[PDB]
Structure formats: structure tokens, C-alpha cells
Design a protein around this ligand. Structure first.
Ligand SMILES: C[N+](C)(C)CCO
Ligand SMILES: C[N+](C)(C)CCO
Ligand SMILES: C[N+](C)(C)CCO
Ligand SMILES: C[N+](C)(C)CCO
Ligand SMILES: C[N+](C)(C)CCO
Ligand SMILES: C[N+](C)(C)CCO
Ligand SMILES: C[N+](C)(C)CCO
Ligand SMILES: C[N+](C)(C)CCO
Ligand SMILES: C[N+](C)(C)CCO
Ligand SMILES: C[N+](C)(C)CCO
Ligand SMILES: [Zn+2]
Ligand SMILES: [Zn+2]
Lengths: 318, 318
């Protein structure tokens, strides 16, 4: 992993003695500090106020103290078991920024446990392994701590204590971008979320995803704007003219199915106001209700319709 | 009451002695005999086989034996309490024929109880009053009878034992023909039934009655034949042209709302196939799909429509 050691303090005291049986998972408790803020403060601060080894934030890891040397990180006896103490910043604005750092945090904690010759377990009853500050607060001997990080901050962004344990113990893989199974496609954002019952523009193209997250393909959808949209076999939102089930429809540049008069090259077409399909061999009343326009069998507006009237008088138009 | 005494036997023996405390309600137990059949048989028969005083059937009452003389009618000790014994025939083909006779039966039983100085009660615990053969069978001393008339035959035509008792004790009024309350009209047939959810022709005129029996007035109804019918303020089924809520409809001679082309005097009108109303200022495609007929703003078919075409070319028709 890439580790920034520019603020790694080399003047910190050893706490306890080897072997160190624990890696400690923390969060800063600061809603505004960046990873650099934390490193700079840690750099100049009085170590007796507490110290640690790594800070994860803003897409990077800054090692601020030694490993395998104990630490004053959990306010109690298990300071003497600290192989490493990893802090996660709490200043994320979005779940995406959080997940980016959470991935590094999980990988770092797991790596440090392996390096220290410890089980990759979270908050178990054995002395060794990865322990949260909460677990230390609750279980360490000679405890002087009331901290319960990082569970509250993780829960904020949707990581339950059961998920944290699972990620620590299994590692974390988030398959992002287009995904597919036997049922259909879905699209996973950087943070693991995916669109459901909504439009999403992906790589310059609009798609719609159903309530389970499945991309709509070869399907109509009446949107919330009261408009009809159509999605072809690739899921792409229809624009322009489309022949759908042997009928012609027209969609504007924003995908909305149009009704009424639409110009096409040298001619005009009329799309049924009720069902949307191109109308043919029909009279359409003018907007001022003065008169009528005739649409030929091929759908094109009759520029110069000619009429013959039988005695009936049945009208034939041409 | 009108009583036919042409077959009144004067040779029957007295049974018991005055006073006679009971009027007995019977039914013949014969599914085919008419009132005359019963009277003729009673006339020639061996009295020891049983006898009575009145037979009600076919819209009349034939007195076949004396009153106030006892009778051999109930096969037991209360033969000696018989002031009168009234038999109802069981050969009715319809509920109407039954009700006609049932009315006479009720009135006769009540009248005979009054005449005999007895309470107009049915099957009570006191010695006196109107007693069914069933009640006698069940309660008389020295019983040799298993007859339970007239309850089964009454129940056949919809008179429960509770109704029989009520009619005997209160008398019976059936208000027939047109009836009305604050909600609407209903029409009561001779037998007390009235039409519900159906057409009924009354005095040469068709009406429709809802599921509670209320006549429909100023209302549409889609019938079971898939046709629409309309009923005006008097309930009469619409035929011919009707303007309903400012729109014109046409109904054929059987009341069915017509759609399509209808001839009227010197002209043709067209009634919308979907909602039925007269169409105006519109083109209607010919049946062979060859051409069109134009309907003027007033709804009349344009015999000689004349067209002018603007460059648009917007068509104006006249
Ligand atoms: C993530 N999937 C789209 C596979 C299913 C959601 O319900
Ligand atoms: C001919 N239409 C106008 C209907 C479709 C064009 O592609
Ligand atoms: C309705 N959307 C704007 C989401 C798509 C079309 O532009
Ligand atoms: C009627 N539309 C064509 C608009 C939607 C398909 O069902
Ligand atoms: C009645 N039609 C309209 C069908 C024919 C005109 O004469
Ligand atoms: C006899 N009524 C019509 C009054 C009511 C039936 O439900
Ligand atoms: C004029 N209509 C034909 C519509 C009605 C006749 O009474
Ligand atoms: C449908 N009915 C026959 C009952 C009435 C019209 O004639
Ligand atoms: C539509 N109709 C006129 C036929 C029935 C009224 O609701
Ligand atoms: C497009 N309209 C049919 C409205 C006008 C013809 O030029
Ligand atoms: Zn902590
Ligand atoms: Zn009897």
C-alpha cells in the first residue's frame, strides 16, 4: 500500500513490550479535520495527550507513528498491546469520500494484523487481533477510557457493526460500474450504491433502472414528469423517430415522447395525442378549429389534398 | 264472504257437544284435486274416513259440512272441539294461484274464529282458538293422527310457520300495484312479489327496477344484452330520439341505444360508436373504408360538402 511517512514521529516512547497482540481501529472524533490536519497536529502535539500510528483520510494513508512499539491510543492497559493504531477521519462530505477511505482503512487494518502475526478478527474474546477503541474501552484492564469509536461514525455512513466485522474478517471487494447477471444489468457507483426507479446518465447516455436496480431494455416507462420514455435493447433512452412494435413514435432530444404535429424534412407528421403513434389516412382538426388537415395513408401531411364527392355524397380524398 | 253451499252435506253426525272451542286449519294433501274435486269427493265419501266443513281453492270457498257440530277432521279427541275445519287445496301451479287462495283461507279462518266466539290465535296453549292439524296431532288427547298440515304446503310457497301465525293473528293485507315512498316507486304483483334488477312491462309500458325493487327514473342502465337503456322522469323506457344532459341519443323501438348511422326525415345523423351521442362537425369513414362522410355542425349529413384548400393546405368544409 502507498504510505506517506512525511509526518512520521520518531521521538515517541515505547509503551509496554513486544509482542504486541493488537491492532486498534479508531476514528478521529473530529468532524472537520483533514488527514493532513490530523498529521500536522499529531506531529506537534504533546504525546501524553495520546498518540497513534496511522491516519486514513482523503484517499491516503499517513503513518504518523511507529508500529510494533505500543502506543497511548486507547486510554488503558491495552495501550501496552498496540502494534498499530489506525485512525479514520470523520470529515467526509459524501458517502463516496467515506467509502474511498473506508476501503483503505479495512485493507490497512488487515495488512497490519498479518504483518504483526495476528488473527484478522474484529473484537473477539481472544487477546490478539483487531480491536476497536470501543472494545478496548469495554474490555481492557486498568481502563481510563470512555471512547466508543469507530462504530458511531461508521454507522453514520451505513456501515453497521456487523458489516465492519465482516469486512475486517473477509476483506472488502466492491465491484463497481456495469454489472450483469441472468436477470439484467445494474450500475454500481464508486460508493457501492446503484440507481433504482430513476434515470441515470452513464458515459454520456441516459438509462432507466427499475426498483431493484435492473436496467430497462426494450420497454416503455411513464416518468414522474407525466411523459412517456422508451428504452431500446441496449437500454439507451430513445430520441428522435423510433418504430416500436410496428408503429412510429417521435421522441424529443430529452427523450420525452411527443404528440401532435412534428416536422420531418420536407413534410409534417401527426402523432396521436392519446397513444402517441403516427396517424395516417385521417383528418385532424386545425388548432383554431377552423378547418382540417389531411394525413395520407403513408402518414405525410397532404399539402394539396384533392376531393371528389359522390352523390352520397361520399368523399374520396387524394 | 262468498260461500258456495251447493255441496254442503246435511247428513253428517254431530261429534262431541257444544261449545266447540277450535277452528282447524288443514290442507288436502292432494297435489292434483281442485276445489270442486274435493267437494264432490267429500259429498259422496264415507264420513268415517274423515270429514270437514270448508274447502278453499281456485278462488272460492265451498262449504261442504256444517259448523258448530264437531267433525272427524283431526283423527283424535279434538274432533270433539271442531267448530269448523278448513281445508286448503294443494294443487296450485303458481304462487299467484296459491296467494289468491291463501288470502281467502286466512280471512275465513279468522271470521270463523270470531263467529265461534274464539280468540284469533294460532296454535297457542289455550284450548280455544285456531289450531293446525299439526298442533292437534301433537297436543290433542286420545290422538290417532300423524298429519302435520298445513305447514309443509304453506312453506312450499314461501309462508313460514311464523308468517302463518302472524297472518292469522293480524289479518293479511297485500297492497298491490304501484307503491311509493320517500325513496321511489315499486310495483307489487298479485302474489306480493315485485321486480328487482329487471325490466317489467306494466300497463303497456316498460320500466326497469333496481335490486331493491325501486323504479329507475332519469337514469341510464347497461342491460345484460350489452345494450344501453335510458329511463325518463316517469321511469318510462326511452325510445326514439332523446336529448339527455344536452346531448342527442337515439333508441330503437325496443329501447336499445343505437350507434352508427340513423335516418331522420330527409337526413342522416351519426351517433358516436363509443358513447352514443350525436356527432357533429366531423368526418366519418365509410364502411368500405373508401372515403368519408361529413357531418355539419348541426349534425346533419352533408349531401354536397364543398371544400376549399389553403396553401397549408388547411381544409375548410361547407
Ligand atoms: C443488485 N441487484 C440488482 C442484483 C439486485 C437488487 O435487488
Ligand atoms: C418516416 N418517419 C418520419 C416516420 C421516420 C423516419 O425515420
Ligand atoms: C428526464 N431526464 C432529464 C432525466 C432525461 C432526459 O433528458
Ligand atoms: C401508449 N404508449 C405507447 C405511450 C405506452 C405503451 O404502453
Ligand atoms: C348513410 N350513409 C352515410 C352510410 C350513406 C349516405 O347516404
Ligand atoms: C319494498 N321496497 C321497495 C320498499 C324496499 C325493498 O328493499
Ligand atoms: C333533431 N334530432 C334528429 C336530433 C332530434 C329529433 O327530434
Ligand atoms: C329488453 N326488453 C325486451 C325487456 C325491453 C325492450 O323491448
Ligand atoms: C355512455 N352512455 C351515454 C351510453 C351511458 C351513460 O353513462
Ligand atoms: C403543421 N400544420 C399542420 C399545423 C400546419 C401546416 O403547415
Ligand atoms: Zn479511538
Ligand atoms: Zn288435516
Amino acid at each position: 500500500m502507498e504510505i506517506n511517512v512525511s509526518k512520521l514521529r520518531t521521538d515517541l516512547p515505547q509503551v509496554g513490550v513486544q509482542p504486541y497482540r493488537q491492532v486498534h481501529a479508531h476514528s478521529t472524533g473530529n468532524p472537520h479535520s483533514t488527514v493532513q490536519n490530523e498529521a500536522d497536529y499529531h506531529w506537534r502535539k504533546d504525546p501524553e495527550l495520546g498518540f497513534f500510528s496511522h491516519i486514513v483520510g482523503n484517499g491516503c494513508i499517513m503513518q504518523v507513528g511507529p508500529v510494533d512499539n505500543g502506543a497511548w491510543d486507547v486510554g488503558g492497559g491495552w495501550n501496552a498491546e498496540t502494534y498499530a493504531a489506525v485512525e479514520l477521519i470523520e470529515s467526509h462530505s459524501t458517502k463516496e469520500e467515506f467509502m474511498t477511505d473506508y476501503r483503505l482503512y479495512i485493507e490497512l487494518l488487515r495488512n497490519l494484523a498479518d504483518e504483526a502475526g495476528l488473527p484478522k478478527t474484529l473484537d473477539t474474546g481472544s487477546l490478539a487481533g483487531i480491536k476497536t477503541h470501543e472494545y478496548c474501552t469495554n474490555n481492557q484492564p486498568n481502563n481510563h477510557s470512555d471512547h466508543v469509536d469507530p462504530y458511531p461514525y461508521l454507522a453514520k455512513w451505513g456501515i453497521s457493526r456487523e458489516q465492519f466485522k465482516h469486512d475486517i474478517e473477509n476483506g472488502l471487494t466492491i465491484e463497481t460500474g456495469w454489472q450483469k447477471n441472468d436477470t439484467g444489468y445494474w450500475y454500481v457507483h464508486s460508493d457501492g450504491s446503484y440507481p433504482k426507479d430513476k434515470f441515470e446518465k452513464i458515459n454520456g447516455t441516459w438509462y432507466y433502472f427499475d426498483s431493484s436496480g435492473y436496467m430497462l431494455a426494450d420497454r416503455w416507462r411513464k416518468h414522474t414528469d407525466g411523459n412517456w420514455y422508451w428504452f431500446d435493447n441496449s437500454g439507451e433512452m430513445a430520441t428522435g423517430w423510433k418504430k416500436i412494435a410496428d408503429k412510429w413514435y417521435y421522441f424529443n432530444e430529452e427523450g420525452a415522447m411527443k404528440t401532435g404535429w412534428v416536422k420531418y424534412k420536407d413534410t409534417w407528421y401527426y402523432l396521436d395525442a392519446k397513444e402517441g403513434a403516427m396517424v395516417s389516412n385521417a383528418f385532424i382538426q386545425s388548432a383554431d378549429g377552423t378547418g382540417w388537415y389531411y394525413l395520407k395513408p403513408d402518414g405525410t401531411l397532404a399539402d394539396k389534398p384533392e376531393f371528389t364527392v359522390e352523390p352520397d355524397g361520399l368523399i374520396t380524398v387524394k
